[model samples]
Target chain A: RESKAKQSLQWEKLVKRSPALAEVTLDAYERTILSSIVTPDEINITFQDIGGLDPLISDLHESVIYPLMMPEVYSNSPLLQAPSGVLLYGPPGCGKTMLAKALAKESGANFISIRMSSIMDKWYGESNKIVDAMFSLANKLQPCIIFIDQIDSFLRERSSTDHEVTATLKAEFMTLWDGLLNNGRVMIIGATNRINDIDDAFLRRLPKRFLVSLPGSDQRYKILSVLLKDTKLDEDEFDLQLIADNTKGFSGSDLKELCREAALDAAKEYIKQKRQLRPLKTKDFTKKLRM
Target chain B: SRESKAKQSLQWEKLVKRSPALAEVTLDAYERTILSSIVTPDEINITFQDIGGLDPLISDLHESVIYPLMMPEVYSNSPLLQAPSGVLLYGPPGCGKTMLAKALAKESGANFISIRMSSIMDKWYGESNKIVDAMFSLANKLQPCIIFIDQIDSFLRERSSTDHEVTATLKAEFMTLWDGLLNNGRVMIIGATNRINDIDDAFLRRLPKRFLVSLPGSDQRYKILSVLLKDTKLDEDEFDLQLIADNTKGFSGSDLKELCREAALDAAKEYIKQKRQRPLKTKDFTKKLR
Candidate 1:
């Protein structure tokens, strides 16, 4: 009897290490709802991979990363309580998702990405159960990051014409979100392009809203430098500043595309001349930029 | 550009000589009330002469739309064979889109029927559709009319699967009625929107003639500034239109107007204080701009 009790305590320690494995009696339905835990090793992204967002990176570290890293210090202080939710909003292809991943990596938190379609079910009363199960799973795995991309699709402003099921699902999610069942370690991060469409209830819950705006001139230059790190260039003639200036209103993704096109054009020129590969010239980028 | 303007003037002369009996048409009391509210050439005092800058847009409107409608006989063959059924104007807010529409009405002498969604949309289901149908029918009766739908993006946004049945039905009814009118060539529909992408694909497909009324460039801004300060008493040595234009890079037409109004007020205060009229100087504009 003494030996059996000792074994039980050992098993409890193991469950603490892997909380997901602790749910031995979870049904197949609940199993399907719970997101796969992404460990620190799985998170290959970090702040270094992102460029030209120094302010946003610092803000995230202060608001989110520091709290998770030293929970005891924040837990006791009422003024320093970690935010329950943070919203990252900006134009499409501006790296909101990438930033969220980097935040998860820096915090060493288990990341669980929840897609809107996965939560929705055709069966009646099933969607509510899935939402409930998801929250419970996140609670079990403490220091977890729940990232929902394009969150506006799920939590749009409620109106009279909304489907009865959709309205109830949003309300149920919000209620669970507000409930004090989970500790402050679990962070729900949502990204969207349409912040205006988010319902007031959801907006109020997400107190820390950040606008991930397009890159300016300096940012554009930084982004170009990062993108062309490995590529050969005519150092004397290649002017990234001039290119950045001309590429006004270009998003980060658009700048990346410009670099890609310039490289491809250089490659074609190499093949046409039947000569050894040479460093890409400013003229190469200028022709493509004009086009 | 000068040649085109001359040709447009000549076409205007022909239209005036053989002015159709558009005003002599009879209308019921309800139709007459609706027509009276619409701006006629006499009521719409704004013309191209009143507007400044937007030379390219004005020229495009003349060649593509106004000239075709005015001289259908001249453009019966070759390019400009038929007048466009619909035209869409999209750009930033407060950039003279409505003014362009009004000017088009004055230039073509078309009976203008500006449709605001608030005035037509009904709370009851099917009622809104009926009102839309009535609006188109009225336009048909009053031939050679321009039906201007302002803020069309809000009225006809992209439809999703979860949209209200009432809204869906109303849009469908509107599209069907509009297509029917397209077959008959007298009436033209002009839609203006800031959120162009929000408009549905089906609605945009019908509007083949799309014009982008983007923010004015440096030269256009200079022209707009000169026109706005034409009447204001400004010291020529102190007035620098080019500097003002350079500073107000992204200012819309309305923004320019606001800046000018503020500068005039500043000059007025100087007069009020010293009992001597002061010319509106560049400093007045520079202070307001900042």
Candidate 2:
């Protein structure tokens, strides 16, 4: 009876922490809408994990992470009110999604990564319910960040050709989002390659927009140094500057691919000789960088 | 019956006048079998009149392609007499590149052979290459035929070492056949692709006549919207196509169709609810556009 009382007390504490869970009974389908909570302790990524975009990191820290972590410091002034929605837009394979994950980790908020396919339902009226439930679940899990990848595909500029149901779904989503903004503790982080495809009203809601541009020479060098930290390279001979100089217009993914190709090339030689293996030469990287 | 005979006689005269070489050409059993797949001009219903907001492109195509085939005598001395064997129509998706190809067929009276790469590809060994070879042979036999390759990038993408042996072989075979078909002035190959950059360099070099079908401008958008809403009744205040076109700066042709469709649905809902009919209002469109 003592152990049962203790368990009930714990359950009451959980319900207090997540008030929405007390009123709503979530089924398996509804449960799927809840983003997997990533506690601060479990988060392996920090701002330090990201190599480039020092300016973006600093801006996010001041504008987003700081405000969420210590709302008391910001809530004193209306000018410093926390933004409800943040959008990270850029070319694919560039690090917009990574930045969002890093922000979630840094803020120590529950990160709920939502894919367009997950919320979309084939059955009529089911999609709107899923979208509504997603917010309610997020609200229950306060200090949570709902991250959407490829947001353009889901909330593209509504055209006459779009299904009536979709327009209503979009309207419902926006209405719920507005409610969440007023209610506090939930933020929407969206990443997209095609920002133009997103509706004007949706874009307005995402006031804190960041353009995750392609890495420049300095950024490339930084990215390469981090990427090749553990790799077997001829440190004395291999010049990262030369590699960075050659890899103009290459995205973060492209730099990673270059390292992969070079590593594979070195492996090929190592297998052929069946003897002492040489460290990856600069030429292995240079040849692949031409692409 | 007499008028039908006269029409056939006129067609014969035009055919002979356009291609004197047709009289000397004879089809073997293999060639006959290949030509059987050709889609004759009468079957092509889409014409310039059907296409909206692409008047300039149509005029250019008519000059560069249609006239060259339809009135070969007019440009007998010019290089255009032998109409470009390779033409590439590249642009954003749903800007009517395929429709332009169809319109070309209708206007030129050329045999239209719409080729989807998936249909040409065979799982069996060496069969894909054989099909590609037959495609060219068929086009050669049926002179004045447009071999419309939709999404050409998918078939002939930039070559990489990792590409399957079969794909590389098929690409090589197609390029070889395409070059050979160039000598046959009557056979024109028109390829359309959204991703022009993905197309192989060899293919691009061969297809010198490239046309870019960009997103519709405000003027073009107005014209497109007018065409889309021509059948639908609109309120006096709702009939401001110019205002709608101005607001829809970035919309493509297909997007306009969607816009019109949505606005019509809004009007439809009102009629269904009140059991009273009224022309679609400007507010119906403005509400959706926003």
Candidate 3:
């Protein structure tokens, strides 16, 4: 692992925006929390790459992107002035994370991903401060999106039966959010399969909820086209509509996996027949021994 | 900068008179660093009793660290018997180095200033050098204060031409202040590190007392598991602690605890779901320790 001491150009951007962190070196607790910084250069997923979920993509652009990217325009009303928190709830592998990353990349915001176990260290008393250092780090780095994948696990329904460390981290995070240390620009983009399991406190903060539902036929066709774009295909024989119709319950991830399996079958046949230039036809998409 | 230092020194003079011990201990950044690192005994729940199955190491520490700091009068004949200016705890990961340091915090009654390595690598060169000075002076005021550097090697990498000048200078400044330890000065540095080979000779020189806190043996694991799984919902007759102890041959003390936690989590999820009276089975632990 590289040392955390090295300065980044992204950090220079923060130093220019907010003068507070120019001199304040990150503390030890933050070295753990601020470990993951996803710059725009890092994330290549723009809105175009995510094929399915057109409505949600449209929802994010005007809702999240415009507000965060150009707060200069939205000075009249609080309608688009930095929506507090955005939640994307859906089944697994349905492009929630992709959509969130697309939002980050598209908006040109400093994206900081907070994994549950990363801040929740083995050390107890130190855990709370890591939470502080998180918003602490986020405060300086404005126009930042804090993305937590599987947010349900960390922000699960609170009960008296929480671990001492787990219990305190929840309180401290909520406390920090409520304290409103963040300016209008910062937002939290959380995705979860278990929406109902999330604590009401966290849900209250996350006002804009986007249901990233499973893809419809048109969404599936778009996803299939993206997945099979570069592959050798007999365009005359290959019926992607038929394939899309056959693949009923396939998620974006499922579609990608199926395409991979089909490509592998084609390659295996090509190899068996002494590696000829054979295009994958409709029948090639028919079978898969996979997930 | 010189004026700020002068202001703090005199302010410290007045502050020292009131307590006979010894800030704005505000307005001062180095003092802020020191204050943040200071963890009182109450914050830590771990104790010597809390640790499992290291009786031999415990007694060895009782001689080297405890007696020397606790009762310096017994070694009145010789200066050699005084506590070393610093100690080096070289051991495997998750093996009891940090646990022992916290135990030192609680039982030794020394002012425990835990200097996490991540914090020490502050960006600027001149400031980090000043931090080393500020920390030691802060420790000297509260004498018998143990300056604990958790992962010593990573923080203080070996002196090499390839490394940054700021890092190299910080190491030099650390050694200089560390050698500032006197015979009467009870302030000690306890550095715990996994890679003992990575440390420099200059540092190894001042830290004369070294201990290797290694992994636990089979019997030691049994003792550890017995203590760790005591409060958990393991039935004695049904749950075979000895079997799991012997079964997990290479497991460290921390590993056994992780295994117990994993097992407890399984049983806890069941218990919270209102599943009736099924105490944790020994079977729950077997799948773990991978």
Candidate 4:
């Protein structure tokens, strides 16, 4: 009877320790605590799910994604001898980074997104060590998609302004990349807006470079159709056809903005008419077509 | 009167023969005698009021024209210290060189003798020279007169590939006529050119004073825009004049006028189609702008 009382006291203390935890039952606690510590694998997005990348998707699939998917065919190729490398270069918001993510998903490769700032250390002579650490991490994780966005910032044309100590760091990085190409299962995918600004030596290693140009009118219509799928609008009242025709020289982001702004306008109109509570009409879209 | 004109022409002919010596006269000495022969202090007709936005230039022209005519006469002082015979205005085009010359004519009680290349160019030998010399002599007879040469470089350019014998002889005779009237305080010659660099060094040095007219800056542009856009009923709600002024980073006054012209056309097209009276839209301006 005395032991039972002592156990009851301990239970009371546990509830007091974290009042919020007391709200959840013991089964919920067990499930949450025992869940897998490993990162849930990145969601796989197929080329079809990514609308409007007709030619580009095929090119990326053939050059970078295909080789990684079927390495046996590339046994004689230097890419198989070394690790794989690819580059996606173009203007901002053209989906280079998104394509990289899609590539990783399709290939089932271990995705490692390198934040450029992580390797560039503030302490003197520590940046090189950080770069070495990054390479070491990549090598350990074989068949990994090591993405370095904005690579031009560091691997740009080296002038007198470049830190001298970092010179060795860059040289060491090239050596590691060479090693990865020869025998490792690592694939280095770099993305940058400034393709010309990057060092030519590093650029030569990128077997496939895709320039994602601006979306033409046809692509703009496709993007708009897909993006506006969730919207509630009658076909007769508004003209998506007319809007698409007028939006010349628009990019993917610009078209996406049009849909979002239209939705906002619809919501605002609905709120203003709440006393009468009329259904959202398509004419509201005309007012928001400035994008 | 015809005989006197003839005799006066003869005297001018004689003076041209001695021009090599006449060319040696200093600009001040040249201006004095020329002004005396061609102008009187009272008949100097030019004034600053005739020209617009050239207040600083008018100030200089005062020193060149009115100050000489005024001082020693306006104050009942000796008439010996009078105006110079030659003043030159040089600058890029559209800076109001001709307007300033007219202002000088209106203020000073002097006859305005306007000369352009079309007036003097002739096929006959020494005919162009004769016309120029005759013009100076006639102006000298009409005391208190001003000879104004617009684009003077067309006549006085340094010997170039395109220059003809007629042009060369005309230039020499021009120098002679100018020298003959040098000490005559009644005649003041005003030469204007956009290309000061192309003008012959001798012609440039002969002028009593040279002044440059520069392009209008932001303040001037603002004043010009306000003046030009007056009563046009511009759409100020969507449009900001300050923003337009800021965006016109390298725009000249002429370019601003072009913008206005294009915008006016844009509005006219809209009005023609809609056929309704509405405030001109700022949206119309975007397509009009380069």
Per-candidate TM equals 0.48, 0.47, 0.48, 0.41
Per-residue lDDT of A107-187 in model 1, one digit per residue for the tens?
666566655434655568777887777776666566767776656656677887775666778888898788656544777
Candidate 4's residue-wise lDDT over A57-159, tens digit each? 8877777665765778877766444335688877654566557656655665555554432343435656566556555544544455667655554455555
Go through the candidates in order and give the clash count of each: 0, 2, 0, 52
Q: Name the runs in model 4 displaced over 4 angstroms.
A: A1-49, A73-83, A179-183, A271-291, B1-290
Model 1: per-residue Cα lDDT over B97-206, one tens digit each: 87788788777777667767764656543355556655666677666667888888977787664666446545655554454212345677788999999987546654
Q: Report the poorest 10 consecutive residues by lDDT, candidate 2 chain A.
A: A268-277
| Per-residue lDDT of model 3, residues A1-291, tens digit only | 222432355466556655766787876666556655665655656788788777778878778778887888886786658777889888655777678767766776777766543454444467688788888777657677888765765676677655666678889889877664544477888876668768899999888899887788889998888766656678698888888887787777667656754654455443334322257778778765221
What ranges in model 3 sit over 4 Å off? A1-25, A180-182, A269-277, A289-291, B1-290
Lowest summed-lDDT stretch of 10 residues in model 2 chain B? B73-82
What stretches of model 2 exceed 4 Å from their correct place?
Answer: A1-29, A35-45, A179-181, A271-278, B1-290
* Chain B TM-score for the candidates in order: 0.83, 0.82, 0.84, 0.66
TM-score of chain A considered alone, across all candidate predictions:
0.84, 0.84, 0.88, 0.73
Error of 2 at B1 (Å): 52
Q: In model 1, which runs have C-alpha deviations exceeding 4 angstroms?
A: A1-27, A35-44, A180-184, A270-278, B1-290
Screening candidate 3 with a backbone cut-off below 3 angstroms (N, C-alpha, C), the clashing residue pairs are none
